[PDB]
Amino acid sequence: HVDLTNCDREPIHIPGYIQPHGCLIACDNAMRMVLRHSENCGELLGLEGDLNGRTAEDVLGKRLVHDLRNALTVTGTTRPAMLPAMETSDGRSFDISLHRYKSTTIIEFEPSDSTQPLGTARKMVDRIREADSVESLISRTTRLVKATLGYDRVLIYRFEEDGAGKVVSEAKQPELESFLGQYFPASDIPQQARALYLKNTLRIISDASGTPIPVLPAVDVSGEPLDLSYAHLRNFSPIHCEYLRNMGVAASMSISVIVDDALWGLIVCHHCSPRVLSMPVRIAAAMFGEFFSMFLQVLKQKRRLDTINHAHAALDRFLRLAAHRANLEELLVDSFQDFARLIPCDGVGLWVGNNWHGHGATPPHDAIPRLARFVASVSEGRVWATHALSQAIPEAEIYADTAAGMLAIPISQVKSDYLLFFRKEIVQNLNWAGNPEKSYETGPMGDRLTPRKSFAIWKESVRLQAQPWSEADREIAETARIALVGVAFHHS
Amino acid sequence: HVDLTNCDREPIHIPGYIQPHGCLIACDNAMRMVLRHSENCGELLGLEGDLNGRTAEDVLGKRLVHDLRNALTVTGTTRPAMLPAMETSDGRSFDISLHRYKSTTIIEFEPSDSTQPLGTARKMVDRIREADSVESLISRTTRLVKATLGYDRVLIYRFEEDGAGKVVSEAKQPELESFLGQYFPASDIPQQARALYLKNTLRIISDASGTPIPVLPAVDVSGEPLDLSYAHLRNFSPIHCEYLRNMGVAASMSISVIVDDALWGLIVCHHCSPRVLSMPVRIAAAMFGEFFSMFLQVLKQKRRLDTINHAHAALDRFLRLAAHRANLEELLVDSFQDFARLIPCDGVGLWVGNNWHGHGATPPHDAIPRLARFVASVSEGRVWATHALSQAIPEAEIYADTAAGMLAIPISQVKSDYLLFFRKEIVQNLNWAGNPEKSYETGPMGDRLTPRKSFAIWKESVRLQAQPWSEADREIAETARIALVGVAFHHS
Ligand SMILES: *C/C=C1/C(=C/C2=NC(=C\c3[nH]c(/C=C4/NC(=O)C(C=C)=C4C)c(C)c3CCC(=O)O)/C(CCC(=O)O)=C2C)NC(=O)C1C
Ligand SMILES: *C/C=C1/C(=C/C2=NC(=C\c3[nH]c(/C=C4/NC(=O)C(C=C)=C4C)c(C)c3CCC(=O)O)/C(CCC(=O)O)=C2C)NC(=O)C1C
Ligand SMILES: [Cl-]
C-alpha cells in the first residue's frame, strides 16, 4: 500500500479514513443529499443503517440543516466554519466543523465540551506581544503552550532553505529526551504534507495507536476519492503513525507558522498518552498561532533592519577612516578582521596585491592562491558565495572542517583584490542537547522512523557544507563591495 | 520596411548597417578570416576592393592581428575590449573596440583622439560620492555630465512599474524647451531596446541625419544576419532617427542605470549638432555610469531603511498611547489622520463600527458604505490595494479626480473595521515644467514621433489611475495591520 519508497509521493489528502474522535458526513455542493459518511456516524449520532442516498433534512433534521446552510453563506472560502454546541434531532449536543472544497460540503461532528476561546487566546497572546526579539518569542512560546494546553512536549521546528527542519525551542517533561538543536531532513516532511500544513493552521492526532474509521464510499462511481484536505478528522499516514509510536508519542497537535505567506515552521505538541482538544481549545490555539506568526514576522523584519543599519554604520566608520589614511592597502591590512562584525562568519581574510592575511577559521596559506585564481575567474567584479566549496573546488574537501563556505567581495574595480568570508561546515557548529546512547523501539518499516536515523541522515546530507549565506548576508556584502570599490577608486 | 505598427517588434540588434563615424570588420570565432565588413572599411583603413574571403593577417597585418587575439583571451565574456591608439600596417592610428558574440569576432575602428579616462572619471565620481539622498545624486548628475561632456541637454529617465519613463532631472541650454516632470509611454522604448540597454552600458548616435554604412554581406549563406548587439557602431531604428530629427536633436549618448540588476533608467545626453565622443571619453562616461548606478542603489537601500524605521517608530508611539487609553475606538477617531505620515497618500479615512471619518482627498460620504462592503468581500483580513479603483468599482469613476487609488488596512481580527489610504489620479499631481504651445516639425510617420504626442498618449493611459503602491508602502501597511489587529485584540 505504502512504504519508504513511495511515501515521498503518498496521497495523504485522500486516505479514505478519518480518526475515531469524531464522525464525518460528506454532502453535495448545496447540502441537499448525503453522498458519503464515516462508519461510526451511527454509533455517535444514534442513526441506524446506511445514510448514503438519503436527503439532508431526513438525517440531521430540518432545524439543524437550516443553521448549517446559512453558515456556508457567511463563510462564502475553503476556511472551515466552527459551530460549537449544536443540538441534533434526538437532543444530543455536538461541536460541528463545516467546510466546502471541490464542490463537496464536509460536516465533522465531535461530542461538545463547553472553555471560552477568546479568553484563553487573549491571555496567551498578551504574554508573547511584549517579546522584543525572535529568540525571546520562540523560547517563551514552547514554555507557554506546554503550560496552557498541558502537552508532555512542545517543540518549534524552523525550516532551513534546503527544507530540513531545526528544533529551535523545547518545553518537555524532565524524564523525556531533548531534541533541542537537532536537525531532521526535508524528506521527513514531504512536499504534499507541507502543502496541507500551509492550508490548515491546526493539525490534531487524537491516538496514534487508534483504529481508523473508513469513509463510505471510499471511492465514488466517477472514480473520485473524498479530498479531506481541510477536514480536521482526516486520518494520518501509517508512516508518520509508526514514527510517533517508535518515539513513545500517542497524540500530537501541530500549529502552522506562516511568515511572508511561506511555511516558516511548526509549533508541535507531543503527548505520551492519547489526547484530543475540544473545538473551543483548538479555536484559541489557532488564534494564538495567527498572532505568534504575525509577531514573529515583524520581529524578523526588525532584526533584518537592525542588521542592515549596523552594517551601514560600520561602513560609514570605515569610509571616515579611509579619508584620513594616505595608504588604503595598509588600512585594509590593519582593519580587515573588523568586517567580520557585518556578516556571521567563522573566519575572514584579505587577498590584496597577491598577498594573504587571515583571521579566524580560514583555508591553509597553501590553498589561498588557487582559491584567489578561482574567485577571479567566476567573480566577474561581483559578490560570489557558496555554502559548498568542495562542489566548486574538489581539493577544498581536505579543509572543509575549517572552511566549507566562502563569500567573496571584490574591493577593486581594476586589480583582482578580494575580502573573503569563511564558515566552518555546519556539523562543527552543532550545539546538540540530546542523548547519544538513547535508542528507539522500531516497527515493520525499520529504524529509519526514529529521530536517531533522521538526524544521522541529515548529518550525511550537509557533509562538507556550511550554513548557507542568507539574503541579508548577500545584501550587506553588496553594500560593502560598493563602499570598498568606491573608496578604492578615490585612492589612485 | 518598418512603421508605427511593427516597430514594437523591430529587430534593432540586426539592422545590417553601422554609423559613419567608424568602420566594422566581422571575423570568425578564432579571428582567422574576414566574414563581413562595412562599405567604408576601404575609405578609412586605406584598403582597396572586397575584404570578404581574405585572411586576418592579410588585411590588418600579422603584427596588429596578434595583439587583438591576445586581448580576447584576457576578455574570456561578451563585454567589449577597448584598445585605444593602435597602429595599422600603413602607420595609421585607430581606437579599436573588440568583442565576440554568437561565435563571431567583431572589430570596430575609430580615428584615435588621445584625454586620460581614469582622470576625467575620478573627478566626476568624486563629485557624486558625497550625495546623501537620491534627489541630491540625480539633480547634480545632469548638471555635472552637461558641464563635463558638453552636451546641449542631459536628462535622467526613471522607468515606472508600468514601463513608462519619467524625466526626473534636466540640465539644458536656456533656449531649449524643458521635459522636466514630463512622462513618456512604455511603447516609446520597446522591450528589445530595453534588452540591449541592459547589455550595453553606453549608446552613441554621432549624426541622426547621417548616411548609414551597409555591412557586406547584409545576410550570409546560412540566412544569418550580423548580430550587432554589443557593437557601439550599430546603426539605430529609422523610427527613433525621425523622433530625434523632429526634436532638433542631431546627436545622442545614453548611459544605462542598472540597480538590483534591473534597468532603473537612463542618463540621456542630447546635442543639437552632430557629436561623437572619443573612446577615452566614452570609457570615462561608462565608468561614471557604473559608480552612479552603485551609489543610487545604496541610497535607494538607505531610503527604504529610513522609511521602514520611521514607520516602526510611529507605530511604537501609537501602541504606547493605546496602553494608556481605555477606549481604543475613540483613540483611532482622534489619531487616524496621523497614519498619513507612514504611507504617501493624498487622503486617509477611518471606517469603524459602520461610521466614517475622512481627512484629505477621499471619496464623498455617499460612496464610503459601498467601498467598505467591497473591501470587506475581497480583503479577507489582509491588506488590499489598487491604483485603479474604477476597474474594481466602475461607479468610483465619478470621484477619480479626488481618489483613484486605495490601500485598505483591516484593524480588527473580527469586526469589518478598516483604515483606508487614498491617492488622487496621477494627472492631478503633475508638476510639468514644459511649454504648452511648443509644437514640433513632423516627418513621414506623423506627429506620433513628438514629445507632445508621447506625453498626450501617456496621460490617456493613466486616466482614472493613481501612483501605484510601492512594495515599501505595502510592507509598512502589513506592519501597521499586525500592530492595529494586535492591540485591537488586547482591548476586549
Ligand atoms: C517517506 C516519508 C516519511 C514521512 C512522511 C510524513 N511525515 C509527516 C509528518 C511529520 N514528520 C516529522 C518529522 C520528525 N522528524 C524527527 O526527527 C522528529 C522528531 C524528533 C519528527 C517529529 C514531523 C515533525 C511531522 C509533523 C509534525 C509532528 O507530528 O511531529 C507526514 C504528515 C503527517 C500528518 O499528520 O499528515 C508525512 C506524510 N516521515 C518520515 O520520516 C518519512 C521517511
Ligand atoms: C514603435 C516604436 C517607437 C520607438 C522605438 C524606439 N525608441 C528608442 C529609443 C528611445 N525612445 C525614447 C523616447 C522619448 N520619448 C520622449 O518623449 C522623449 C523626449 C522628450 C524621448 C527621448 C528614448 C528616450 C529613447 C532612448 C534614449 C534617447 O535617445 O532619448 C529605440 C532605440 C534607439 C536606439 O538607439 O537603439 C527604439 C527602437 N520610439 C517611439 O516613439 C516609438 C513609437
Ligand atoms: Cl484538483
Ligand SMILES: [Cl-]
Ligand atoms: Cl554606506
Ligand SMILES: [Cl-]
Ligand atoms: Cl540566439
Ligand SMILES: [Cl-]
Ligand atoms: Cl512595531
